[PDB]
Amino acid sequence: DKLKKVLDKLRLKRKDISEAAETVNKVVERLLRRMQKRESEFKGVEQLNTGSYYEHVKISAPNEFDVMFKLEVPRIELQEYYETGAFYLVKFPLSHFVLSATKMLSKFRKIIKEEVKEIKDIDVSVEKEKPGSPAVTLLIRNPEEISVDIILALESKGSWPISTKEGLPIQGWLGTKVRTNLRREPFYLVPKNAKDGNSFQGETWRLSFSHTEKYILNNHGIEKTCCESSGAKCCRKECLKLMKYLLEQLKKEFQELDAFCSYHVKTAIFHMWTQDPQDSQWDPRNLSSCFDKLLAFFLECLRTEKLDHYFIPKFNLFSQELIDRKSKEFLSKKIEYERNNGFPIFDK
Amino acid sequence: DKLKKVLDKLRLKRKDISEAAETVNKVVERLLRRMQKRESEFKGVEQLNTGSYYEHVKISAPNEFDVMFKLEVPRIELQEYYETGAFYLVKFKRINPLSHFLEGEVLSATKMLSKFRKIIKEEVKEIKDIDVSVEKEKPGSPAVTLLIRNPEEISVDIILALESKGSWPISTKEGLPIQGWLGTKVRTNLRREPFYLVPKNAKDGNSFQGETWRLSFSHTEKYILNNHGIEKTCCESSGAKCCRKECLKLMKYLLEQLKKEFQELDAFCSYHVKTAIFHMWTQDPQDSQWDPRNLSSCFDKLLAFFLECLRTEKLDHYFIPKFNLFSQELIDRKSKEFLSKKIEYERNNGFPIFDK
DNA sequence: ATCTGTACATGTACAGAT
DNA sequence: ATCTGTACATGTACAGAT
DNA sequence: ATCTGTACATGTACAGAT
DNA sequence: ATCTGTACATGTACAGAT
Ligand SMILES: Nc1ncnc2c1ncn2[C@@H]1O[C@H](COP(=O)(O)OP(=O)(O)OP(=O)(O)O)C[C@H]1O
Ligand SMILES: Nc1ncnc2c1ncn2[C@@H]1O[C@H](COP(=O)(O)OP(=O)(O)OP(=O)(O)O)C[C@H]1O
Ligand SMILES: [Mg+2]
Ligand SMILES: [Mg+2]
Ligand SMILES: [Zn+2]
Ligand SMILES: [Zn+2]
């Protein structure tokens, strides 16, 4: 009962979706035209919608959209960045950009910013640049506030880099045919825009499988009929929404949680889904015991500082080098507290 | 156990398969290239391997291969022939490599098939490697059949197909009812792939005889056979085995064995058993209703179903539900009760015909 | 110089053979 | 159990054509 | 090459049936 | 409370026309 009521509060309304998307769409098509039908260095970018709104796991409001402008770049060679798994140098139209992420992102940002100054019918400005975002973020003021991430991404049709060979362990869940087919799809590089003052940081790209994650969200069952009109609904996404909400509520209260994000929850539940592949283990009637085991799994990830990237298994999202242990135990205690006390944080 | 041992006799041999496939591929590759050359009306034709060998349900010996030479034919058409569901006249809107086969807008299937056959025949004379001749045309068949004596005997049906990328003809709207078994996402995708038209090629002396085409879904059937489960891992290296293909195999063998002894069964063929089992797989969707341990009862329920189809004279085409392959107009009830008894005998007597 | 239809290159599920 | 040969999807190099 | 058109899956919303 | 059925909405893939 309780979790249900939370999910109805989390539900987006058809009317807010209609108005939010029609304005987002207007802006994104225009920015896409400016890239192509003007003789630019990104002539030929294609649009690919990603993220939780397009996975149907967006909660609360339709106020955050994610769009990837992807560009095919042929026979480009990669080189792994100090055995990290996820970050790569790109070596060999793109002349005026080793292919530089910061240089290529900067012009991309310029073009979008020029085009946004010429918007006159929608209240839209470009958010200030951020450290660690490959994105140009647009703040749109409908009556309401909507943010849009325009992600720049290179697209390579070659086979996936060696670090992902162990990745994507869907063989017991979605299957070897699905895996092999997914691995025939392209793979994508986005800017690692870190400002860490470290090393190759300006020339570093990050792998991106947002297109694979989108498929999996939309094809998440062991039975092909999971959540279709002639099958049984499951509660896999409803658990992801509840765990995203718990993290969102926590992050609002405790800035000591600034270094956590929804992709940690996303990653953790890809692992749970592979641990519990049967659709019956995610029966709607077990929603409470399913949330519960997901919190437990997330608490074992915090406690052991181990959250491997579902596609790059040697890339630990919970390594000391990314998040301090105090932050993890901070989060453990809040999680433990909410869990044993029937989630008071949900009731506000 | 009894049924396991049959399956072991039915299994093909990798040694036979290598020798068959090498020869067959050499020929098919050479006829496809010849299609490509010159001002051939069939330049652009494209190969597509179909049938039980490429579905991994070919039994006994690898002695029969089916290959589509398929040709994309843009520009719309299609006039359903007398509400039969399955048969169509092809019309053209522009006035073209297929200029020669037209009869004012209408594409002559037999004229197309005649030229196809002459070209295949001309290119067969010039093969000097392997013993391969072109079998005499059989009525009601879109195929050009190669008999190969790679020492042993091997058939290869070259089927001429037109390929249309449009949405499927409306007589399939209610067909392919996989929603509860393979699901709607699958159905929509499958219905987005092209559909194919092959020459009917009957010499019945009915109107439009030489201009009638028949629908073909062999590409959809191949997907279905290699993707037959509710669970995505059915029969994969990290999932549970089933016995769906094993039942079809046992069904096909009973029919083949019977069809050898008794010529009363000429009007029956493996598409009949194949069709009946697509219905069975839709009736029993779950992988657990096809557990390998239950092979006997699965084969049993499939037989009883087939017998009811025979006896009530109803075997609806899986893709064109208004097309009844067992309608009186296709097979005499005499033939249908002859098969009912022969099946009933085998079933009540521990399948003697398997021991042959 | 450039382009491209054809054929090779690469990867893996399936299923038989050990 | 592991090993292996065929089929098939997709990427890519190239001799020959523009 | 760009763009529209078509079909349908995934949603929300709600009324009536269990 | 849950389930089924219809209406209303957006996203998406691709054929065919420009
Ligand atoms: N740290 C990261 N490493 C790799 N990929 C990431 C990372 N953060 C985000 N992504 C990718 O970018 C996608 C969009 O990011 P983001 O908007 O933050 O998340 P989301 O999944 O849309 O969740 P919300 O529901 O909006 O919180 C999701 C994922 O494919
Ligand atoms: N009467 C028919 N109506 C529609 N499609 C047919 C018909 N007969 C055959 N086909 C199609 O052509 C394919 C090849 O037929 P055929 O060679 O007789 O059987 P098969 O499936 O190859 O099995 P076997 O070779 O007999 O083991 C199977 C099916 O997709
Ligand atoms: Mg989002
Ligand atoms: Mg065959
Ligand atoms: Zn589901
Ligand atoms: Zn199976």
PDB file of N, CA and C in Angstrom, chain A residues 170-178 215 218-226 228-231 278, chain B residues 178-186 223 226-234 236-239 286:
ATOM      1  N   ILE A 170      24.538 -10.361 -19.626  1.00  0.00           N
ATOM      2  CA  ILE A 170      23.105 -10.601 -19.734  1.00  0.00           C
ATOM      3  C   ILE A 170      22.784 -12.037 -20.147  1.00  0.00           C
ATOM      4  N   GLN A 171      23.799 -12.918 -20.254  1.00  0.00           N
ATOM      5  CA  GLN A 171      23.621 -14.244 -20.862  1.00  0.00           C
ATOM      6  C   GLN A 171      22.639 -15.127 -20.086  1.00  0.00           C
ATOM      7  N   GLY A 172      22.526 -14.941 -18.773  1.00  0.00           N
ATOM      8  CA  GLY A 172      21.564 -15.732 -18.038  1.00  0.00           C
ATOM      9  C   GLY A 172      20.221 -15.086 -17.930  1.00  0.00           C
ATOM     10  N   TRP A 173      20.124 -13.852 -18.417  1.00  0.00           N
ATOM     11  CA  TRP A 173      18.932 -13.034 -18.223  1.00  0.00           C
ATOM     12  C   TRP A 173      18.294 -12.689 -19.566  1.00  0.00           C
ATOM     13  N   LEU A 174      18.920 -11.839 -20.392  1.00  0.00           N
ATOM     14  CA  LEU A 174      18.402 -11.539 -21.723  1.00  0.00           C
ATOM     15  C   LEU A 174      18.919 -12.494 -22.811  1.00  0.00           C
ATOM     16  N   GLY A 175      20.088 -13.120 -22.636  1.00  0.00           N
ATOM     17  CA  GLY A 175      20.505 -14.154 -23.555  1.00  0.00           C
ATOM     18  C   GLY A 175      21.758 -13.871 -24.367  1.00  0.00           C
ATOM     19  N   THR A 176      22.360 -14.926 -24.926  1.00  0.00           N
ATOM     20  CA  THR A 176      23.546 -14.721 -25.753  1.00  0.00           C
ATOM     21  C   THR A 176      23.200 -14.103 -27.103  1.00  0.00           C
ATOM     22  N   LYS A 177      22.019 -14.410 -27.642  1.00  0.00           N
ATOM     23  CA  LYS A 177      21.621 -13.775 -28.889  1.00  0.00           C
ATOM     24  C   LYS A 177      21.441 -12.276 -28.675  1.00  0.00           C
ATOM     25  N   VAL A 178      20.744 -11.886 -27.601  1.00  0.00           N
ATOM     26  CA  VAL A 178      20.554 -10.458 -27.347  1.00  0.00           C
ATOM     27  C   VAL A 178      21.908  -9.788 -27.133  1.00  0.00           C
ATOM     28  N   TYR A 215      17.724   0.200 -24.494  1.00  0.00           N
ATOM     29  CA  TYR A 215      17.151  -1.054 -24.944  1.00  0.00           C
ATOM     30  C   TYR A 215      16.803  -1.930 -23.751  1.00  0.00           C
ATOM     31  N   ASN A 218      13.811  -1.122 -21.879  1.00  0.00           N
ATOM     32  CA  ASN A 218      12.626  -1.382 -22.678  1.00  0.00           C
ATOM     33  C   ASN A 218      12.448  -2.868 -22.992  1.00  0.00           C
ATOM     34  N   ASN A 219      13.432  -3.712 -22.641  1.00  0.00           N
ATOM     35  CA  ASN A 219      13.461  -5.151 -22.925  1.00  0.00           C
ATOM     36  C   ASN A 219      14.091  -5.881 -21.745  1.00  0.00           C
ATOM     37  N   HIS A 220      13.456  -5.765 -20.595  1.00  0.00           N
ATOM     38  CA  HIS A 220      14.083  -6.058 -19.327  1.00  0.00           C
ATOM     39  C   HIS A 220      13.683  -7.393 -18.754  1.00  0.00           C
ATOM     40  N   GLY A 221      12.897  -8.201 -19.479  1.00  0.00           N
ATOM     41  CA  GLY A 221      12.383  -9.434 -18.926  1.00  0.00           C
ATOM     42  C   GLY A 221      13.079 -10.689 -19.425  1.00  0.00           C
ATOM     43  N   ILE A 222      12.919 -11.782 -18.681  1.00  0.00           N
ATOM     44  CA  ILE A 222      13.367 -13.050 -19.260  1.00  0.00           C
ATOM     45  C   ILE A 222      12.333 -13.553 -20.268  1.00  0.00           C
ATOM     46  N   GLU A 223      11.048 -13.299 -20.020  1.00  0.00           N
ATOM     47  CA  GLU A 223       9.988 -13.622 -20.964  1.00  0.00           C
ATOM     48  C   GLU A 223       9.807 -12.436 -21.907  1.00  0.00           C
ATOM     49  N   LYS A 224       9.662 -12.718 -23.202  1.00  0.00           N
ATOM     50  CA  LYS A 224       9.512 -11.649 -24.180  1.00  0.00           C
ATOM     51  C   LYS A 224       8.238 -10.836 -23.963  1.00  0.00           C
ATOM     52  N   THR A 225       7.262 -11.369 -23.221  1.00  0.00           N
ATOM     53  CA  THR A 225       6.013 -10.661 -22.993  1.00  0.00           C
ATOM     54  C   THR A 225       6.009  -9.831 -21.707  1.00  0.00           C
ATOM     55  N   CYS A 226       7.102  -9.817 -20.935  1.00  0.00           N
ATOM     56  CA  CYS A 226       7.145  -9.011 -19.715  1.00  0.00           C
ATOM     57  C   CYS A 226       6.661  -7.592 -20.000  1.00  0.00           C
ATOM     58  N   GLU A 228       4.127  -6.363 -21.496  1.00  0.00           N
ATOM     59  CA  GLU A 228       3.408  -6.068 -22.719  1.00  0.00           C
ATOM     60  C   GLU A 228       1.908  -6.281 -22.498  1.00  0.00           C
ATOM     61  N   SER A 229       1.106  -5.972 -23.521  1.00  0.00           N
ATOM     62  CA  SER A 229      -0.344  -6.057 -23.367  1.00  0.00           C
ATOM     63  C   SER A 229      -0.824  -7.498 -23.180  1.00  0.00           C
ATOM     64  N   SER A 230      -0.121  -8.486 -23.748  1.00  0.00           N
ATOM     65  CA  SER A 230      -0.478  -9.890 -23.541  1.00  0.00           C
ATOM     66  C   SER A 230       0.447 -10.612 -22.574  1.00  0.00           C
ATOM     67  N   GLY A 231       1.166  -9.887 -21.724  1.00  0.00           N
ATOM     68  CA  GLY A 231       1.979 -10.540 -20.716  1.00  0.00           C
ATOM     69  C   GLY A 231       1.673 -10.090 -19.300  1.00  0.00           C
ATOM     70  N   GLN A 278      14.637 -14.080 -13.176  1.00  0.00           N
ATOM     71  CA  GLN A 278      13.262 -14.534 -13.379  1.00  0.00           C
ATOM     72  C   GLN A 278      12.270 -13.395 -13.216  1.00  0.00           C
TER      73      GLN A 278
ATOM     74  N   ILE B 178       1.239 -14.420 -32.181  1.00  0.00           N
ATOM     75  CA  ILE B 178       2.311 -14.765 -31.248  1.00  0.00           C
ATOM     76  C   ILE B 178       2.302 -13.882 -29.995  1.00  0.00           C
ATOM     77  N   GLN B 179       1.252 -13.064 -29.817  1.00  0.00           N
ATOM     78  CA  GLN B 179       1.291 -12.036 -28.782  1.00  0.00           C
ATOM     79  C   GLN B 179       1.500 -12.623 -27.397  1.00  0.00           C
ATOM     80  N   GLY B 180       0.972 -13.820 -27.129  1.00  0.00           N
ATOM     81  CA  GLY B 180       1.057 -14.356 -25.781  1.00  0.00           C
ATOM     82  C   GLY B 180       2.204 -15.286 -25.588  1.00  0.00           C
ATOM     83  N   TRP B 181       2.927 -15.524 -26.671  1.00  0.00           N
ATOM     84  CA  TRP B 181       4.020 -16.466 -26.740  1.00  0.00           C
ATOM     85  C   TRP B 181       5.325 -15.747 -27.045  1.00  0.00           C
ATOM     86  N   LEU B 182       5.438 -15.147 -28.228  1.00  0.00           N
ATOM     87  CA  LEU B 182       6.616 -14.364 -28.534  1.00  0.00           C
ATOM     88  C   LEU B 182       6.427 -12.868 -28.256  1.00  0.00           C
ATOM     89  N   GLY B 183       5.200 -12.376 -28.135  1.00  0.00           N
ATOM     90  CA  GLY B 183       5.001 -11.012 -27.685  1.00  0.00           C
ATOM     91  C   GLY B 183       4.744 -10.016 -28.813  1.00  0.00           C
ATOM     92  N   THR B 184       4.267  -8.841 -28.414  1.00  0.00           N
ATOM     93  CA  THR B 184       3.858  -7.841 -29.390  1.00  0.00           C
ATOM     94  C   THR B 184       5.054  -7.135 -30.024  1.00  0.00           C
ATOM     95  N   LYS B 185       6.060  -6.782 -29.219  1.00  0.00           N
ATOM     96  CA  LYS B 185       7.250  -6.167 -29.797  1.00  0.00           C
ATOM     97  C   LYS B 185       7.798  -7.026 -30.928  1.00  0.00           C
ATOM     98  N   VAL B 186       7.835  -8.352 -30.722  1.00  0.00           N
ATOM     99  CA  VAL B 186       8.330  -9.257 -31.758  1.00  0.00           C
ATOM    100  C   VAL B 186       7.419  -9.211 -32.975  1.00  0.00           C
ATOM    101  N   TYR B 223      12.877 -17.298 -38.600  1.00  0.00           N
ATOM    102  CA  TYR B 223      13.099 -16.586 -37.353  1.00  0.00           C
ATOM    103  C   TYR B 223      12.404 -17.302 -36.221  1.00  0.00           C
ATOM    104  N   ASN B 226      14.235 -20.427 -34.972  1.00  0.00           N
ATOM    105  CA  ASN B 226      15.446 -20.156 -34.206  1.00  0.00           C
ATOM    106  C   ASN B 226      15.211 -19.189 -33.039  1.00  0.00           C
ATOM    107  N   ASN B 227      13.955 -18.860 -32.727  1.00  0.00           N
ATOM    108  CA  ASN B 227      13.611 -17.910 -31.657  1.00  0.00           C
ATOM    109  C   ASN B 227      12.227 -18.285 -31.129  1.00  0.00           C
ATOM    110  N   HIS B 228      12.118 -19.509 -30.652  1.00  0.00           N
ATOM    111  CA  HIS B 228      10.847 -20.166 -30.444  1.00  0.00           C
ATOM    112  C   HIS B 228      10.336 -20.119 -29.012  1.00  0.00           C
ATOM    113  N   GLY B 229      11.018 -19.428 -28.094  1.00  0.00           N
ATOM    114  CA  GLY B 229      10.659 -19.563 -26.695  1.00  0.00           C
ATOM    115  C   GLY B 229      10.024 -18.349 -26.059  1.00  0.00           C
ATOM    116  N   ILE B 230       9.342 -18.521 -24.934  1.00  0.00           N
ATOM    117  CA  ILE B 230       8.920 -17.325 -24.224  1.00  0.00           C
ATOM    118  C   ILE B 230      10.114 -16.701 -23.512  1.00  0.00           C
ATOM    119  N   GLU B 231      10.991 -17.529 -22.946  1.00  0.00           N
ATOM    120  CA  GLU B 231      12.205 -17.033 -22.328  1.00  0.00           C
ATOM    121  C   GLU B 231      13.255 -16.797 -23.403  1.00  0.00           C
ATOM    122  N   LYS B 232      13.931 -15.652 -23.323  1.00  0.00           N
ATOM    123  CA  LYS B 232      14.932 -15.322 -24.325  1.00  0.00           C
ATOM    124  C   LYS B 232      16.083 -16.322 -24.343  1.00  0.00           C
ATOM    125  N   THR B 233      16.262 -17.108 -23.279  1.00  0.00           N
ATOM    126  CA  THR B 233      17.380 -18.032 -23.216  1.00  0.00           C
ATOM    127  C   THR B 233      16.998 -19.467 -23.555  1.00  0.00           C
ATOM    128  N   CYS B 234      15.751 -19.720 -23.946  1.00  0.00           N
ATOM    129  CA  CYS B 234      15.345 -21.063 -24.333  1.00  0.00           C
ATOM    130  C   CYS B 234      16.326 -21.677 -25.323  1.00  0.00           C
ATOM    131  N   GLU B 236      19.545 -21.773 -25.200  1.00  0.00           N
ATOM    132  CA  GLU B 236      20.831 -21.096 -25.280  1.00  0.00           C
ATOM    133  C   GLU B 236      21.802 -21.657 -24.232  1.00  0.00           C
ATOM    134  N   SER B 237      23.087 -21.317 -24.386  1.00  0.00           N
ATOM    135  CA  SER B 237      24.127 -21.912 -23.548  1.00  0.00           C
ATOM    136  C   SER B 237      23.974 -21.573 -22.061  1.00  0.00           C
ATOM    137  N   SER B 238      23.129 -20.594 -21.699  1.00  0.00           N
ATOM    138  CA  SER B 238      22.848 -20.259 -20.301  1.00  0.00           C
ATOM    139  C   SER B 238      21.354 -20.252 -20.001  1.00  0.00           C
ATOM    140  N   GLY B 239      20.609 -21.135 -20.660  1.00  0.00           N
ATOM    141  CA  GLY B 239      19.199 -21.311 -20.406  1.00  0.00           C
ATOM    142  C   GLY B 239      18.844 -22.778 -20.508  1.00  0.00           C
ATOM    143  N   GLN B 286       4.359 -21.550 -22.866  1.00  0.00           N
ATOM    144  CA  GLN B 286       5.430 -21.676 -21.881  1.00  0.00           C
ATOM    145  C   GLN B 286       6.488 -22.703 -22.297  1.00  0.00           C
TER     146      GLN B 286
END
